[PDB]
Amino acid sequence: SSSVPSQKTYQGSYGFRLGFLHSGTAKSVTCTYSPALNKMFCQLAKTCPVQLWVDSTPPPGTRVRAMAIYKQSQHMTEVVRRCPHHERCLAPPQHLIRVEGNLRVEYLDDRNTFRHSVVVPYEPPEVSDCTTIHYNYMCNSSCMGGMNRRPILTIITLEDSSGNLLGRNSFEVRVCACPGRDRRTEEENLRKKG
Amino acid sequence: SSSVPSQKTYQGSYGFRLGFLHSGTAKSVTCTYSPALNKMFCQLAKTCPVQLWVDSTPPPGTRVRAMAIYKQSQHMTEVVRRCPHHERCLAPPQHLIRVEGNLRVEYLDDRNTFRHSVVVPYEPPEVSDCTTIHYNYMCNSSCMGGMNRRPILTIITLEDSSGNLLGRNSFEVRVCACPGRDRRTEEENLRKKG
DNA sequence: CGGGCATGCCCG
DNA sequence: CGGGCATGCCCG
Ligand SMILES: *C[C@H]1C(=O)C2CCN1CC2
Ligand SMILES: *C[C@H]1C(=O)C2CCN1CC2
Ligand SMILES: *C[C@H]1C(=O)C2CCN1CC2
Ligand SMILES: *C[C@H]1C(=O)C2CCN1CC2
Ligand SMILES: C[C@H]1C(=O)C2CCN1CC2
Ligand SMILES: C[C@H]1C(=O)C2CCN1CC2
Ligand SMILES: [Zn+2]
Ligand SMILES: [Zn+2]
């Protein structure tokens, strides 16, 4: 009955985890992940790679879904969408999250919650310990009429073809002009005032 | 043959001038006019009163047209429009400038230049030295996908019913959250660095 | 209200 | 590139 998808971490029986590349905090890095904050800082319309780690191999037909929700309680019931400017300038223009480099991407609009998601087949790592998906976020967190400075969580779910939830993980995202600057500011604020 | 409307001041044979109320520079004033900069600072979707002064009375049927153009050479050929966010949230939604409080307003989209303008009948001052029109600017200068931080000029023309230009004046506009702050900053910069 | 944090971006 | 100006707005 809830229209708000769950965000609670569920590593599940396959030992599903996410992982992220190390990139550092130079002012101009295109993306950078903060383990302390469990938060990706990235630039709009640029690659944001996410690694899928599993302990046990999921069954054939498993899918990987990504969906954004607002992190703050007061905004969690509002659907996360592209702002009108970037909508106008495969993926429907209203979708915030895209996957690049995949021939089997599917973009979904839920008929009951109206929430957007993007799904690709799960592929096991090559003869490697993880699989990488290249996500793109098509608005800045600050975009007026879209995210409007509100932080989001991206929820990644591993689902079998029957729709069973096999695993769930999430991470906070800030899409911004200067990921390295902003990661440094938020980590310093965590240390001084968190 | 030009698609860029003239901005050159033409006081003309009726002695046409604009005038503005004095309001000062408190951080929260809703609008404030800088004589030194010939520039109105105002807030979006709030009243921006403009006075029409004439020495001689225009003929019956005279009209008052307002149009925005970009002030900087590199942007002057681009039509000034409402941004997509405020377009979606009598006046066509794409028009930046509205007139409030007038039963005879007309909104025009030029069939050749595609430029927008808003026109009201000229009314002589009451048995007073000027007539006031209440304009509204429906985007901030900073709106993404609209003015995008580019300064505009508003061009006010006094036209007879046959279309003769009787007079023309213009003023720069900044639509912003804090007119009083921003007028003070720009006047100080004029003094220190202009 | 006024102080000052925010965050895209600097081109007259 | 990194410094710092910009400019809406501060609500976990
Ligand atoms: C943002 C992205 C990059 O450009 C490399 C470093 C960090 N992340 C993975 C690869
Ligand atoms: C973050 C900062 C940089 O280092 C370049 C990209 C965006 N911003 C301006 C230049
Ligand atoms: C912006 C507007 C106001 O609110 C009064 C002072 C200045 N201007 C005219 C009236
Ligand atoms: C300019 C400043 C003010 O004084 C109020 C209006 C907008 N901004 C925040 C509050
Ligand atoms: C998990 C991830 C790594 O750490 C490298 C790059 C691709 N996968 C295998 C080797
Ligand atoms: C010109 C203008 C003024 O200065 C006041 C207000 C209205 N008009 C007449 C009196
Ligand atoms: Zn956007
Ligand atoms: Zn706007």
Numbering used by the authors:
A (entry chain A), B (entry chain A): 94 to 182, 188 to 225, 227 to 293
Give passages from the manuscript.
In addition, we present the structures of MQ bound to DNA complexes of the rescued double mutant R273C/S240R, referred as R273C/S240R-DNA-MQ, and two types of MQ-modified wt complexes referred as wt-DNA-MQ (I-III) and wt-DNA-MQ (P1). MQ-C124 is well defined in five structures: R282W-DNA-MQ, R273C/S240R-DNA-MQ, and wt-DNA-MQ (I, II, III). MQ bound to C229 is observed at high occupancy in all p53-DNA-MQ structures. Significant local disorder at the turn of S7/S8 (residues V225, G226, S227) is observed in wt-DNA-MQ (I) shown in d, associated with the presence of two alternative Cys-bound MQ enantiomers (MQr in light green and MQs in dark green), and two alternative conformations of E224 and of residues S99-Q100 from the neighboring p53 dimer. One E224 side chain forms a salt bridge with R267 and a hydrogen bond with S99 from the neighboring dimer, shown also by the other structures, whereas the other E224 side chain forms a hydrogen bond via a water network with the carbonyl oxygen of MQs bound to C229. In the p53-DNA complexes where the two DNA half-sites are contiguous and hence the two dimers are parallel to each other, MQ-C229 conjugates are located at the inter-dimer interface. MQ-C277 conjugates were observed in all structures of mutant and wt p53-DNA complexes. In the other MQ-modified DNA complexes, the carbonyl oxygen of MQ is oriented away from the DNA and toward the L1 loop. A local conformational change in L1, relative to that of the MQ-free complexes, leads to different stabilizing contacts between S121 and the backbone of the 5′-end nucleotides without affecting the nearby K120 interactions with G3 and G4 bases. In these structures, no direct MQ-mediated hydrogen bonds with the DNA bases are observed, except for a water-mediated hydrogen bond between the MQ carbonyl oxygen and G3 base observed in the three structures of wt-DNA-MQ (I, II, III) represented by structure (I) in Fig. 9d.
The human p53 tumor suppressor is a 393-residue protein that in response to cellular stress, acts as a transcription factor by binding as a tetramer to a wide range of DNA response elements, activating various events including DNA repair, cell-cycle arrest, senescence or apoptosis. Mutations in the p53 gene were observed in more than half of human cancers. To uncover the structural basis of rescuing p53 mutants by MQ we investigated by X-ray crystallography high-resolution structures of the core domains of mutant and wild-type p53 bound to MQ in the absence and/or the presence of their DNA response elements. These studies reveal diverse binding modes of MQ to specific cysteine residues that stabilize the proteins and their interaction with DNA.
